[PDB]
Amino acid sequence: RWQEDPEPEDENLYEKNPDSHGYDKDPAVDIWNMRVVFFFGFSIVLVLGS
Amino acid sequence: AKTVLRQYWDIPEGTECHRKTYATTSIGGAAGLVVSAYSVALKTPTSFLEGVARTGRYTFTAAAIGAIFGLTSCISAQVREKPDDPLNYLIGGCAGGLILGARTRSYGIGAAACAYMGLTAALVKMGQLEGWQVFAEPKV
Amino acid sequence: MSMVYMNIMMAFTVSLVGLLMYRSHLMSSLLCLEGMMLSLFVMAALTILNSHFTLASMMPIILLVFAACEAALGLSLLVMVSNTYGTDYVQNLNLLQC
Amino acid sequence: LQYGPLAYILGEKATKKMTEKSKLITVDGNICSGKSKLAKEIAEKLGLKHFPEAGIHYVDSTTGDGKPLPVQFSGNCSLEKFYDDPKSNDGNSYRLQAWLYASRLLQYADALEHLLSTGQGVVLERSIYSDFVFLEAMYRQGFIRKQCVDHYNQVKKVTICEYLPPHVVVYVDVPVPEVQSRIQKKGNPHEMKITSAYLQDIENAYKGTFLPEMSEKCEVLQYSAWEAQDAEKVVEDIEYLKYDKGPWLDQNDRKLHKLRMLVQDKLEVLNYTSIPVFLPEVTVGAHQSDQVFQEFTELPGRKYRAGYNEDVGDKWIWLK
Amino acid sequence: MLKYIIPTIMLMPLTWLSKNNMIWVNSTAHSLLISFTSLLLMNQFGDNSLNFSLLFFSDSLSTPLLILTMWLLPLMLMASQHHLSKENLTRKKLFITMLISLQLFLIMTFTAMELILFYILFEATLVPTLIIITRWGNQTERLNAGLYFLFYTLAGSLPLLVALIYIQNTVGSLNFLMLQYWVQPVHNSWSNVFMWLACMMAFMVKMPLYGLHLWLPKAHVEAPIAGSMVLAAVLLKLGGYGMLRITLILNPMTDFMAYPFIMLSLWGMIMTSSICLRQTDLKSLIAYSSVSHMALVIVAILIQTPWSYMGATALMIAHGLTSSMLFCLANSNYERIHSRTMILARGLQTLLPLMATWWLLASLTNLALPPTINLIGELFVVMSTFSWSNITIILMGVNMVITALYSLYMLIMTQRGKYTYHINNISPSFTRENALMSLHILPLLLLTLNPKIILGPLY
Amino acid sequence: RQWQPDVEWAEQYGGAVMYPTKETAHWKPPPWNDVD
Amino acid sequence: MNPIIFIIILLTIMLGTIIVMISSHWLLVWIGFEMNMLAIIPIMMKNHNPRATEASTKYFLTQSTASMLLMMAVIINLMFSGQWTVMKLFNPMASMLMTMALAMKLGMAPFHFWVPEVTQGIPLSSGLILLTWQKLAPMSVLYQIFPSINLNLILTLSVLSILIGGWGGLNQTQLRKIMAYSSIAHMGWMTAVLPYNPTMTLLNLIIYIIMTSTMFTMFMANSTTTTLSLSHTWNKTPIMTVLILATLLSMGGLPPLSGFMPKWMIIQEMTKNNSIILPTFMAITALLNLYFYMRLTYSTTLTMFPSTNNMKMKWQFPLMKKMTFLPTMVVLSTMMLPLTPMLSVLE
Amino acid sequence: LLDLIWLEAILPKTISLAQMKASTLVTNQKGLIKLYFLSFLITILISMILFNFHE
Ligand SMILES: CCCCCCCCCCCCO[C@@H]1O[C@H](CO)[C@@H](O[C@H]2O[C@H](CO)[C@@H](O)[C@H](O)[C@H]2O)[C@H](O)[C@H]1O
Ligand SMILES: CCCCCCCCCCCCO[C@@H]1O[C@H](CO)[C@@H](O[C@H]2O[C@H](CO)[C@@H](O)[C@H](O)[C@H]2O)[C@H](O)[C@H]1O
Ligand SMILES: CCCCCCCCCCCCO[C@@H]1O[C@H](CO)[C@@H](O[C@H]2O[C@H](CO)[C@@H](O)[C@H](O)[C@H]2O)[C@H](O)[C@H]1O
Ligand SMILES: CCCCCCCCCCCCO[C@@H]1O[C@H](CO)[C@@H](O[C@H]2O[C@H](CO)[C@@H](O)[C@H](O)[C@H]2O)[C@H](O)[C@H]1O
Ligand SMILES: CCCCCCCCCCCCO[C@@H]1O[C@H](CO)[C@@H](O[C@H]2O[C@H](CO)[C@@H](O)[C@H](O)[C@H]2O)[C@H](O)[C@H]1O
Ligand SMILES: Nc1nc2c(ncn2[C@@H]2O[C@H](COP(=O)(O)OP(=O)(O)OP(=O)(O)O)[C@@H](O)[C@H]2O)c(=O)[nH]1
Ligand SMILES: N=C(N)NC(=N)NCCc1ccc(I)c(Cl)c1
Ligand SMILES: [Mg+2]
């Protein structure tokens, strides 16, 4: 039938980055994303908020 | 149309059934004729006889609904001794809906018509009791 | 009202019914449209003349001039229709059904 | 002043610029018929602008930096693949033909715009009027389906009717055995796989449908392979034409203003080349088209309207 | 409220002016900061509400809903950034913009002093919500789900508009503080019956009431994860919050008008709870669980007692976090096996030990284990409906049994038993997923230590 | 991946009407350029 | 058409409307309609094809009939009052004839049949004039004669138009016909409130014109006349699809968009007059319009329809259509709700 | 029986059918000038004889 791209294969983030936190493919961005979530989420809102 | 509606609402509910059934049948007949006129003008019948058959079919179908509603709703008010009750119109409205199912030979249309026309008649009775305005006179 | 108004009002109604009940020729419906104007011209003239409304005496002329210009436009559309199909039959003007 | 009603009102009328030399000339013929060389000579001698035949990358040549774009931005149409596998299941045969008609339509619009804006005539190699000979040949060899032909005629019906035909049609008549001889001599590996039957169908369409049709409305000049070498004689024939037929005689400043308003707006020119007719050969799925379009926007000088691309050196953008 | 409206608006220039690779980092960080400042709304008094201005006020009802709303935005960004990774940059920013605009409407909706202002913002939330479902939903049926969601709401909300305008003509104001003092009793009449229905049906459809709930399982099965989170956590509570406010001006007619809707809710919760035992799609099961939990809230609101209003508020907050957790847990399985079928992937506790703990904790809150705020809210409702009529305890008790059965059934089927042999892509839980789960359960369980802040004005 | 309309879905909106009946079975989509 | 002639014909269309709006004499009102109708026919015919000739002829017959009925009402009014002042009429038969004549000119149901056919048969720019500017002159007459209009007649015309307009649009795939039926429904809102507060009629008319102009302009920018053609916009001008989505949701009356405002204020004015059943019926019936607006958004913006290979050739050329006032019109079409109290300028 | 059938039937499923049927009545017109102007005559007559809008 028509001209359509094939379905891509789902990529496991751990292949390229075994240390991946699951936020981003870029390891530097991935680590920063983990840090803001953990710092502003747990250290600030949950601890100081509590 | 204002003269017939004046006659119908002048009679007390649950009394003078034959007069009530005549007003609603004539009202139903008028609506049937109006529908037939537009139907014949906008959808040309194949022949003169086919146009007459369609006009009678719609007109009788509409007068049949108007008669059953008037008769059934007037008996319900008489039998129950409940004149100012919307439930009588709900019973009369659903009865007319069933006729439409029969005349259109269908069970879904009859059931749908019973509920929608049954509710509409009940709402009409409430508006008469509570003075609801459909075309309200400008006041402010 | 005066007796003449009966027939002049009737003439407008006859031409209005004629206009609304088409047959085949588009020209025939244009004639009914100009008949309507004619009855309007006569009724307006009678009212204005009888009441001695002096300045309104020009109004029927203005009505006549503008209505003739409208009729000229209608005739132009009729010939364009006739050029397309070879007749002025209104049954041919049904492409915009779909 | 960019052309428009205001420019037209102020005296930019076509009849001013157009002379008796303001002629649109098209050269036609079979494959390897020598039309390319004849077209250049005619243009040189008459001082006309020459348009090389519009191919798969004609549109790229008129936009951006003018260089051809990758193949995915033309749909992966390939003339080479057409010779290698004319019956390929991927629909390349008609996808190419539909793309080539749009390319020719664009070039014809460019040629008319040049003629109407400058007054200088043009020479084209084939046109939207003769493009169908390839489609008929394709269909008769069983390379495309009947539904492809129906699609082609729909697009042609609503596009070709907007434009005026050439003033002069020049046909070079080389027989099929000679064409095949010239194809093998040219030595292009893919072209040599052409069948004489395909070439005979091209000629049949040319002589059966094209030339008789254009004769009713154009000046049709025919030459053999030998007669086409004498370019001067061809140009002598052109200069002695009477121009007593065709709709170019009915044209006037009013009608040519509407025509110039059309050919200058290329999106309006190509409007009906993408009619929503879901033919498998030309239909592109949403995911592919979306992906390809994002790639196109990333090409140099293509993200923004021309003149607003800082990555290719445009300046004063904050005042433009 | 401008101290929350403006920084919420500023999230949009932040997302659009961020570096291409920092849109998730920046939007998540700053929406967590906004969530932090929202705790200042806890300045609540025993007698008076916190009346900021002519447009906005906060009280003990809207304050917990406001804090839940602003907390959910960073959680939604965390949950969405993975399945949107392939999406092009401009469309990623448009998605985040729809989430931000949803929060802006929500915080204004919950603090609007005037009821017609509440209406417009209450209606505005449809637009971004519909866009999120239809544009970024995965399957063909998102288009139908969008329509059912849109037209169920408008079928009820348009009559509410007429009723609200009618009330303002009669009373002269729709300011909620004014109505507290100028409220007059609603007398029996057919006009007042339909005024009552117009004032209530829109909120019933959103809750959703049993019989008007069929749009909700559709919406969830088709929505992306963030759509499901905001739908379950907050958007359902627009109905409850609306009902809690408007019932002020419907007395004493609510005494008898509530009967059909109490019957639908009381019987509805047992039906929907029973339905959960047979659901084959995990998202659909969680969706039906919401209908059952919110049937309790409808009953609580309709019987109008201090205990029922306190229980209704706690239930709305507790369910918001629990149902959002459950959707996030189900989504994390979907991102691996790409199917919502509950029976497809079994025995996941063997492969994902820590994720099975989150599954256990979420299930325990769903069945209302004491002393979670899920149980506190449910218990307060059960206590108050017992006084309303002692027989309700039988229906309330049966639902508690069925709720435990389907909650543990969902846990047992997906986490226990034997793993499915051919499913060999169950990769270890990401830090993002674990953090997302804990950002639901931890505030939920911490609220047990100070429940008063989620008990509402009647506390 | 996310479903997007295919040719089957899109052809639902390419007819003369949205709801074909016996009356309109003969209707055809008008010319692309309005010219008959 | 010669560009200078096209300008003079456009100015005559405007002048005819202006004459209707500034006249105190009934004859001048009639002249304004005659002049306006004469000048609009050439822009219906400009593309010279049988469909454009049929549309121009169907339009001419309808408008000429309506103008004859109008002149009858004027002459009957003269007979029974001896004056020509444009104001309330002095005879109920004259009022019915003028109301029916103006309903015919506006294309209100059941005099609506010409609107979808004429709009379909003329170019987009001509349809833009037909469905916006042409509403001004008849509505301005209704603004002045409304005290003498039969309430039952006008409200019946309004209710029918809202039903016919809503139902008629459900079956349409042609954009011009969708706009035509959408126009019919919106006229019903304008006349339903006229007996109660003409100011709200003006508000609805102005906002309707703005959103209608926006949609026609966006259709013209892409030369789209069918749903399927419009579904190719995402693969050419993605911004345009977002603007179309926002405008359609506004024409659907969804808060917080501008198109909620006229429906909101009409419901208020009717309820102040103890009209509850009618506004509620109108609001629920307007959901029919929202349905087929939403259908367009699905095929244009919220899903990506299949494309064609030749579309790639379009990626290399920019939009060169004027799109005059489009950025302003789209912002007014969607973002005006916070300024609703500004409606008092129309008082 | 209830949540996938009858609660569907009594409202969204039946309501959509009625509108679709009503739309086909309104739009299935023959495009004939004669039939449209004939309906205008019926409308004007009905407006007077039935509803007395001329009073
Ligand atoms: C799905 C629902 C669809 C829409 C349903 C709409 C329901 C609208 C309610 C019907 C209108 C109200 O009903 C109307 O009320 C007024 C109030 O006196 C009555 O008015 C009547 O008053 C007296 C009797 O009291 C009569 O002598 C007089 O002839 C008449 O004017 C009307 O005879 C009645 O028909
Ligand atoms: C759609 C039909 C198109 C063709 C129109 C044909 C022309 C119509 C001519 C109308 C002129 C007559 O108009 C009519 O005259 C009579 C004469 O007093 C008026 O008077 C009549 O009604 C009023 C009521 O208060 C009183 O004067 C009196 O009861 C009665 O005589 C009517 O109020 C007026 O409506
Ligand atoms: C007087 C009325 C006008 C008021 C205008 C006030 C603001 C004017 C801003 C002018 C500068 C805009 O800057 C222009 O847009 C963005 C943001 O900077 C930049 O491009 C952007 O790409 C991506 C986001 O898409 C990011 O990496 C980053 O945000 C930026 O690099 C352009 O490279 C720059 O040329
Ligand atoms: C009581 C208050 C709320 C009432 C709300 C009711 C209003 C209507 C809501 C749904 C509107 C959806 O509008 C339309 O509905 C029908 C089914 O109903 C959908 O159609 C769907 O069901 C029908 C009937 O089984 C199937 O034939 C069809 O294949 C399927 O797609 C349409 O694709 C949708 O466009
Ligand atoms: C409480 C009042 C609420 C008022 C809300 C009004 C909502 C109006 C919604 C649009 C109605 C028309 O919507 C249209 O309905 C029909 C019938 O269901 C659907 O039609 C679909 O279902 C029918 C039923 O089996 C199938 O035969 C048909 O093949 C299928 O296409 C259309 O796909 C849908 O586009
Ligand atoms: N399928 C297809 N091929 C085409 C079309 N136009 C050109 N071609 C091919 O492009 C190639 C070059 O065409 P020609 O100009 O005729 O050959 P040429 O030898 O280079 O030029 P001449 O010497 O003048 O004959 C040939 O293989 C043609 O078949 C077309 O419209 N469709
Ligand atoms: N005819 C109507 N009911 N409406 C109407 N215009 N009433 C006049 C009352 C009014 C309202 C607002 C303003 I500001 C002003 Cl100055 C006057
Ligand atoms: Mg060559």
Side-chain angles (χ1 to χ4, degrees), chain B residues 84 86 126-127 129-130 132, chain E residues 188-195 253:
Chain B
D84 288 319
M126 296 172 219
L129 298 159
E130 315 246 332
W132 296 349
Chain E
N188 260 78
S189 68
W190 287 113
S191 336
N192 280 337
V193 153
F194 284 100
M195 191 209 70
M253 169 162 274

Side-chain angles (χ1 to χ4, degrees), chain D residues 38 42 170 221 223 227-228 230-238:
Chain D
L38 178 59
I42 290 168
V170 178
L221 290 162
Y223 306 93
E227 289 167 0
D230 198 20
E232 288 188 300
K233 174 56 164 48
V234 171
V235 163
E236 183 191 306
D237 296 14
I238 283 160

Side-chain angles (χ1 to χ4, degrees), chain E residues 131-181:
Chain E
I131 288 162
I132 279 151
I133 299 166
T134 61
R135 179 69 209 197
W136 283 284
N138 227 54
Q139 307 185 297
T140 311
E141 313 71 59
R142 67 190 186 260
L143 300 184
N144 277 345
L147 292 175
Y148 272 59
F149 171 67
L150 177 59
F151 283 103
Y152 262 86
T153 307
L154 294 178
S157 73
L158 284 174
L160 168 69
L161 178 57
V162 178
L164 288 180
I165 297 157
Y166 165 82
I167 286 155
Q168 203 223 22
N169 295 333
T170 301
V171 181
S173 204
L174 281 169
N175 186 272
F176 190 70
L177 304 178
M178 284 306 291
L179 296 168
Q180 276 167 260
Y181 301 110

Side-chain angles (χ1 to χ4, degrees), chain D residues 219-320:
Chain D
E219 304 283 357
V220 178
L221 290 162
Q222 320 197 29
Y223 306 93
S224 47
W226 187 245
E227 289 167 0
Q229 313 317 287
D230 198 20
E232 288 188 300
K233 174 56 164 48
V234 171
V235 163
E236 183 191 306
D237 296 14
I238 283 160
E239 291 162 13
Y240 300 10
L241 286 172
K242 282 313 192 243
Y243 303 115
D244 69 307
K245 318 179 263 184
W248 276 102
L249 304 177
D250 295 354
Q251 301 311 305
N252 51 32
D253 296 299
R254 189 186 49 82
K255 273 135 84 81
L256 293 186
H257 164 71
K258 314 304 287 138
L259 178 51
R260 176 158 181 199
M261 286 300 299
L262 165 56
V263 294
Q264 84 174 1
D265 183 8
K266 301 308 183 297
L267 283 188
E268 192 67 283
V269 169
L270 300 163
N271 178 224
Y272 296 126
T273 53
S274 300
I275 49 163
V277 176
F278 296 123
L279 194 77
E281 287 83 332
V282 295
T283 303
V284 181
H287 297 291
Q288 174 160 107
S289 10
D290 177 41
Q291 197 266 312
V292 176
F293 186 44
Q294 297 319 315
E295 273 184 57
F296 178 89
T297 55
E298 299 157 23
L299 294 160
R302 298 298 196 160
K303 180 156 187 203
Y304 300 109
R305 167 185 306 261
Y308 292 90
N309 287 276
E310 233 151 77
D311 69 4
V312 301
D314 289 327
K315 309 283 144 138
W316 300 106
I317 279 154
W318 57 279
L319 277 181
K320 262 150 51 161

